[PDB]
Design a protein that fits this description.
The chain is an alpha+beta fold. It has 22 helices and 22 strands. Bound molecules: the ligand CN(C(=O)Oc1c(N2CCN(CCO)C2=O)cc(C(F)(F)F)cc1C(F)(F)F)c1ccc(F)cc1, 2'-3'-dideoxyguanosine-5'-triphosphate and magnesium ion. The site of magnesium ion (MG) has 3 residues, from loops. It binds a DNA duplex through helix 11, strand 13, helix 16, helix 17 and helix 20. It comes from Homo sapiens.
DNA sequence: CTCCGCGCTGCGA
DNA sequence: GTCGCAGCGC
């Protein structure tokens, strides 16, 4: 195709930079090749048609020194008041990282990612690939990717150095394929009214998500190995104690040789012979072994799936003098939530105690949320949304009882256990509060009486009286739920607070399980997704105002090249109703004021949003803050 | 065929 | 190598 090598002639280069400055929209494809590791060889630009303007950064005019080329490169990729420029890149979060870390260019224009648009048009769709966006939106240029089998991988074609094709060809092909496909996706977004969401909350959230990836969460490898050795010892003692409690050895992973010990060798009560966790919690009250196996599964899940993984992905930050974990973002969820991968620092286990030693042992707290530490002379500011997924239900269902218990102040999860266990509300521990939290949310979202009785440890008909009490007590929640399945059946889609549409065609299926899944999924999506929006619209506005009062830097990777006092706040992790920031000592109070002022001013609902700000030297060592 | 929802990950088949 | 089951987390 038309591949203009702009860096070949001096007059040809300056004409490309002149035309580049008149563009209010263009495309980029970072070209990366092997060393013979990654290495940005060049770049690709497109403003229309099948013209690709390769920007070699390594056959070239000697008068165009690399340094003179990099000045013009940053002269066109930086904002200058009302430039109105909107770039289109295939992987914005990783292209913004590679450009900042391998070239020194901190992008400041507007951004448009075709992958985000493909998800915003169908959250249930498959992860977009360049072959999946061309086949669906630009099929008339599909014969271009012929031979380029790398188009079927989520890695950008220009960033896939493993392909035998040159980095120039791979980037030039992608530059025109993503520019024209974005014009088609922009035409579809403008039709469904969702174009504003793509550029006002969604794509600017991926910018904050690219910043947190360069920042990374702190990690204390010494606190991990200490918490590990306490856990392995209890694991080592649970095996020996359990193997004496049964007389013979038995693998805690073989449900066959476990049900033998419990239901047969120990004559424990029971469809039957199930070593499930819902059953072993009921049998926990009869023999020490049903509780020792549940502890074996808790420690093993930690010392294998949160400990050993975290001590693998740890990296050194020589500038900050720390060892920080570098997770990966993933916003491709059906509810709009943001999850993390490699490693998932969202699944870090909660604070749990182990009792080791003679007599009644000795209490030993194991908070694995505690090795995550701030920088020298820093803090970790966490801000909760209280009960966001229930205050939203109050704004939609308008139930006069859910709003009553919301303004009261009681912990309704504890109050559920007070009615369940017939215990004082203040006596409800966290283990029972979490079990009652699952009972609270599941019953609202359509938990059956069979699963309720199995969790509650009571009969099916006994648990059915608890469900029918909820329907009678809270009556506005079901008026909306029956009206929600009315609006999803007539339309075939559920809409969030921002207009995002999840398409549920299974609500008309002939199978009762299939209609129920979509019926249930419709009620969760309208409230789980509306919460992921309220978080996202707050996440962007907090980085916006932190960038206003900005005598600081905006990311640890940004300041890694400018080098100095680390003064500003930083992003690290986002839980589905809680935002964590790594603020610096000097302005712990200012950021906490911005994080909380914006998390409330993010949306305006019937029920005002309550936000609880906490602060400390660890994600587990958190204490309240006044703001 | 089988009835809260979303999400990731290691092991075993 | 690939996917299901089940462990934890919102
Ligand atoms: C019938 N029942 C109940 O009502 O529990 C609540 C409650 N509570 C908590 C205390 N309480 C008394 C007046 O406030 C009340 O109504 C609140 C809510 C929500 F605030 F979220 F709306 C949801 C639920 C529910 F669990 F039903 F979903 C119940 C069901 C299973 C159990 F193990 C214990 C109780
Ligand atoms: N359906 C469903 N949603 C859940 C479940 N656990 C968490 N969620 C969703 C709904 C609430 C939201 C926040 O979860 P958290 O665990 O932060 O809960 P919380 O009740 O807001 O927290 P707390 O009262 O302890 O501050 O995530 C669950 O088991 N089922
Ligand atoms: Mg919470």
């Amino acid at each position: 195709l038309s591949i203009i090598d702009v860096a070949s002639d001096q007059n040809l280069f300056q004409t490309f930079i002149k035309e580049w400055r008149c563009k209010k929209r263009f495309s980029i494809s970072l070209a990366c090749e092997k060393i013979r590791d990654t290495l940005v060889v060049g770049l690709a630009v497109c403003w229309g048609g099948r013209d690709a303007y390769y920007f070699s950064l390594g056959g070239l005019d000697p008068s165009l020194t690399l340094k003179d080329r990099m000045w013009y490169l940053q002269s066109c990729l930086r904002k200058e008041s009302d430039k109105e420029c909107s770039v289109v890149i295939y992987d914005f979060i990783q292209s913004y990282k590679i450009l900042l870390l391998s070239c020194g260019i901190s992008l400041e224009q507007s951004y448009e990612d075709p992958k985000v648009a493909c998800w915003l048009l169908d959250p249930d769709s498959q992860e977009p690939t360049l072959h999946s966006i061309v086949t669906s939106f630009l099929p008339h240029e599909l014969p271009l990717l012929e031979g380029m089998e790398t188009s079927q991988g989520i890695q950008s074609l220009g960033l896939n150095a493993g392909s035998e094709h040159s980095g120039r060809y791979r980037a030039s092909v992608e530059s025109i394929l993503i520019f024209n496909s974005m014009n088609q996706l922009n035409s579809l977004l403008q039709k469904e009214n969702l174009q504003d969401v793509f550029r006002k909350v969604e794509m600017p959230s991926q910018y904050c998500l690219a910043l947190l990836e360069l920042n990374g969460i702190g990690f204390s490898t010494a606190e991990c190995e200490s918490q590990k050795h306490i856990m392995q010892a209890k694991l080592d003692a649970i095996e020996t104690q359990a193997y004496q409690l049964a007389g013979h050895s038995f693998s805690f992973t073989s449900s066959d040789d476990i049900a033998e010990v419990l239901f047969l060798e120990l004559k424990l009560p029971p469809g039957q012979f199930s070593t499930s966790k819902d059953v072993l919690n009921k049998l926990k009250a009869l023999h020490p072994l049903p509780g020792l196996i549940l502890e074996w599964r808790r420690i093993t899940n930690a010392i294998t799936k949160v400990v050993f993984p975290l001590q693998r992905e740890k990296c050194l930050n020589p500038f900050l003098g720390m060892e920080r974990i570098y997770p990966v973002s993933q916003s491709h969820t059906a509810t709009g939530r943001i999850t993390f991968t490699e490693p998932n620092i969202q699944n870090v286990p909660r604070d749990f105690e182990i009792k080791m030693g003679g007599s009644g042992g000795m209490p030993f707290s194991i908070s694995m949320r505690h090795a995550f530490v701030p920088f020298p002379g820093g803090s970790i500011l966490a801000a909760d949304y209280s009960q966001l997924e229930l205050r939203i239900l109050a704004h939609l269902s308008h139930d006069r009882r859910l709003i009553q218990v919301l303004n009261t102040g009681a912990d309704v999860f504890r109050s559920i256990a007070a009615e369940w266990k017939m215990i004082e509300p203040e006596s409800v521990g966290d283990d029972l509060r979490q079990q009652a939290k699952q009972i609270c949310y599941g019953i609202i979202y359509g938990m059956g009486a069979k699963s309720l009785g199995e969790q509650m440890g009571i009969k099916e008909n006994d648990a059915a009286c608890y469900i029918d009490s909820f329907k009678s007590r809270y009556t506005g929640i079901n008026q909306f739920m029956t009206e929600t399945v009315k609006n999803c059946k007539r339309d075939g889609f559920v809409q969030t607070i921002l207009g995002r549409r999840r398409y549920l065609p299974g609500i008309k299926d002939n199978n009762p399980y299939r209609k129920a899944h979509a019926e249930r999924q419709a009620i969760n999506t309208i409230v789980q997704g509306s919460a992921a929006d309220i978080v996202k619209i707050a996440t962007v506005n907090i980085q916006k105002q932190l960038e206003t009062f900005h005598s600081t830097f905006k990311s640890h990777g940004h300041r890694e090249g400018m080098l100095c006092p680390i003064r500003g706040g930083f992003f690290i992790l986002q839980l589905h109703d809680e935002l964590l920031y790594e603020v610096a000592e000097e302005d712990v109070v200012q950021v906490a004021q911005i994080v909380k002022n914006e998390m409330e001013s993010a949306v305006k609902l019937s029920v005002k949003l309550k936000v609880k700000v906490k602060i400390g030297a660890s994600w587990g060592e958190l204490k309240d803050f006044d703001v």
